[PDB]
């Protein structure tokens, strides 16, 4: 399986950097070596993307607390949550009894930037 060896393994950082650099400096004179230049460049281009993402979420963090639900240990519980919802109809048989009327409170807030009172 596979093809003829074209370059270093992935974990060989200095070797891959050489091929990635040649992508811009020395033009390839064969498909195999051009493909190697892309793969070695893929290592660094993909690392940079992940790097910026990590940087961006530290320097400009997400503000919601929903992401606490994306913790690894909470993943199994979330899976069970979607398989264990109460059976019934999506339509409401009876009016919902809530202590607050978010729809009306939201209409007034969007209109006066003030609570109903």
């Amino acid at each position: 399986s596979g093809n003829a060896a074209r370059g270093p393994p992935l974990y060989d950082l200095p070797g891959n950097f050489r091929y990635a650099k040649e992508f811009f400096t020395k033009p390839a004179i064969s498909y195999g070596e051009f493909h190697q230049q892309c793969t070695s460049l893929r290592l660094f281009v993909c690392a940079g993307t992940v790097g910026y993402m990590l940087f961006s979420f530290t320097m400009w963090p997400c503000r919601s607390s929903y992401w606490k639900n994306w913790a690894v240990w909470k993943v199994p519980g979330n899976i069970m949550h979607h398989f264990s919802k109460r059976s019934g109809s999506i339509f409401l048989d009876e009016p919902l009894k809530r202590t607050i009327d978010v729809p009306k409170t939201y209409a007034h807030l969007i209109a006066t930037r003030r609570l109903p009172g």
Partner: protein, 86 residues
């Protein structure tokens, strides 16, 4: 030409024994996720007498019982429909 110990027949039984179990589970999990959604959106609810149920429905929804074509789709399934639906 044809033999039971042939690479073809022994690679076709091996593949079946190996994949059919995995696959049955995999498809079943999808079918299970489908039921979880379905039972939470429209759970099948069993009524005793269809005629009484239909009346309570027409009364509850303000629908004229004359304009509603009630048809029996299956031995255990009836269906009320609008008769004046485009």
């Amino acid at each position: 030409m044809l033999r039971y110990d042939s690479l073809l027949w022994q690679c076709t039984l091996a593949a079946g024994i190996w994949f059919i179990p995995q696959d049955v589970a995999a498809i079943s999990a999808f079918l299970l996720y489908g039921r979880s959604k379905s039972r939470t959106i429209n759970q099948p609810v069993y009524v005793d007498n269809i005629d009484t149920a239909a009346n309570e429905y027409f009364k509850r929804k303000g629908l004229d019982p004359t304009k509603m074509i009630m048809m029996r789709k299956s031995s255990k399934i009836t269906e009320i429909r609008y008769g004046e639906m485009y």
